[PDB]
């Protein structure tokens, strides 16, 4: 089989260059292609790659991801989650391809405790949440064979993620404040690429799984406990924290332009029982990102 | 499904510790474990473990891989790769258990330009080699279901690797001596922890593909032209070299003491068409570990 990966140098993208490597013969491109076009900015282009190369299989790691800027730039923010999906969706189902695609929890409005299943209703408290879900509708309605993974509070080792820039707070200050009223499951790009690659076999001998999948680590936790369990990692392995006192707040009193949820959890029963997968808990892919980045030698 | 993991923390396990996380409930253990014993000095304490958690599936990465080291301790060897392995596949196939193994292409003598394949003959060149093939017809004898895989030339991004150690030398030295004779494909511990994923999936659900595989990326090399990709790889990083001479070597020159085979190439076809996997180019792995190591930021 050929796949083709696009977004392949972000967190989950580069996660997936890997994971995907074994499931078949891989074509990875980002908007840097040159010899092939991964800018999601030109749908049409996107939409001429999948006819140039006609895969078996297309994963989209590639969107608009800034949640804020997405506001200022809900145009660009349209384009890249939803327009394009819509035209790499029409594409796909030429050759009866199949599309991965990732989304968010943020496609849900806010109501602390209950983890929201798949058949809940929709109403996306910002542009990014509003666009996804105008991508998700658009892959529904122009493409059968298709998997959509909503996810949420994705990291990655590579490059930038919530850990290190807390880590990076923690070794220049002295006390911190972080929210404790916004919950989820962290869910390692790691979790997310493996997931993929199995579901992509199941679903090619039983397409009776194509739909609508929460996909996140287990459990549910907070900014406030994920930072907490950061630094006492980072303490048991011998990192020294100028940090001396971790402080709890509200949401509002820090300003962030795009509304973010306070329930962001996620019901993943549905994922579970149909490609017969586990879903860890949400420290174990921490941690072991935490030791990869505290155990580098040169 | 449980998932009983001993060596966790080699390079093959570490990347386990990832790639089974989804296949099932993973139990990784070591030599260290406290709570659990996964010493292999202790034949009838790995059985007893296997004996305590009743897994569906045991994958063992954990073996005394010091080539070198195993002539002086063939005894230790013995234990390690033989022993340990007829005690873990006795206790396995008590429950009707998978055990997934891992081998080596020491297995094989030399002879230049023909791939190995699994219906060849074989007559181990070394201790290290001769303990592994114990240890496979140990497993083979003991247990009907399981998984071998061969490989060769194994490197992981986490910790000490061919890579490191050679450029290591390319900073600090100005011209290097490096074997030109010996032939194989590196094969990345990640390659081997998501073949083995899909591995153990394909066998729970078709018992048929049982036995003995050839598992190693695509295409061959030798040490030599793997250290001048290294190299090459290290100055389009922007790493400078101290060195400015690559000269190749004949493998007798400098001393190894255990027998290391000229031809360690595999042909995995075997592999390939009962799992329907795909194995790269060697080069793609070694050249996204080499990045990895390359773009580290704190
Ligand atoms: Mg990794």
Avoid at 223 to 242: N, S
Wanted: with cysteine.
């Amino acid at each position: 089989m050929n796949i083709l990966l696009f977004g392949k140098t972000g967190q989950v993208g580069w996660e997936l260059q890997r994971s995907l490597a074994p499931v078949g013969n891989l074509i990875a491109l980002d908007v840097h292609s040159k010899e092939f076009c991964g800018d999601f900015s030109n749908p049409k282009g996107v939409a001429e790659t999948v006819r140039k190369l006609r895969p078996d299989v297309i994963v989209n790691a590639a969107a608009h991801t800034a949640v804020d800027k997405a506001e200022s730039e809900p145009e660009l923010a349209q384009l890249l989650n939803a327009t394009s999906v819509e035209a790499i969706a029409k594409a796909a189902n030429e050759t009866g391809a199949w599309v991965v695609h990732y989304s968010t929890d943020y496609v849900f409005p806010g109501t602390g405790d209950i983890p929201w299943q798949e058949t809940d209703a929709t109403s996306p408290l910002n542009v990014y949440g509003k666009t996804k879900l105008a991508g998700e509708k658009a892959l529904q309605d122009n493409c059968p064979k298709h998997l959509i993974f909503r996810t949420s509070w994705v990291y990655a080792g590579k490059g930038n993620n919530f850990a290190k820039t807390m880590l990076r707070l923690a070794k220049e200050r002295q006390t911190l404040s972080v929210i404790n009223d916004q919950y989820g499951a962290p869910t390692g790009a790691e979790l997310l690429a493996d997931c993929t690659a199995h579901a992509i076999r199941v679903a090619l001998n039983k397409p009776e799984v194509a739909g609508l999948y929460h996909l996140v680590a287990g459990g549910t936790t907070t900014w406030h406990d994920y930072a907490a369990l950061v630094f006492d990692e980072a303490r048991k392995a011998g990192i020294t924290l100028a940090l001396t006192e971790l402080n709890a707040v509200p949401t509002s009193a820090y300003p962030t332009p795009a509304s973010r949820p306070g329930n962001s959890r996620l019901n993943t029963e549905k994922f579970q029982r149909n490609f017969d997968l586990i879903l860890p808990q949400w420290e174990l892919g921490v941690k072991r990102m935490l030791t990869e980045m505290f155990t580098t030698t040169t």
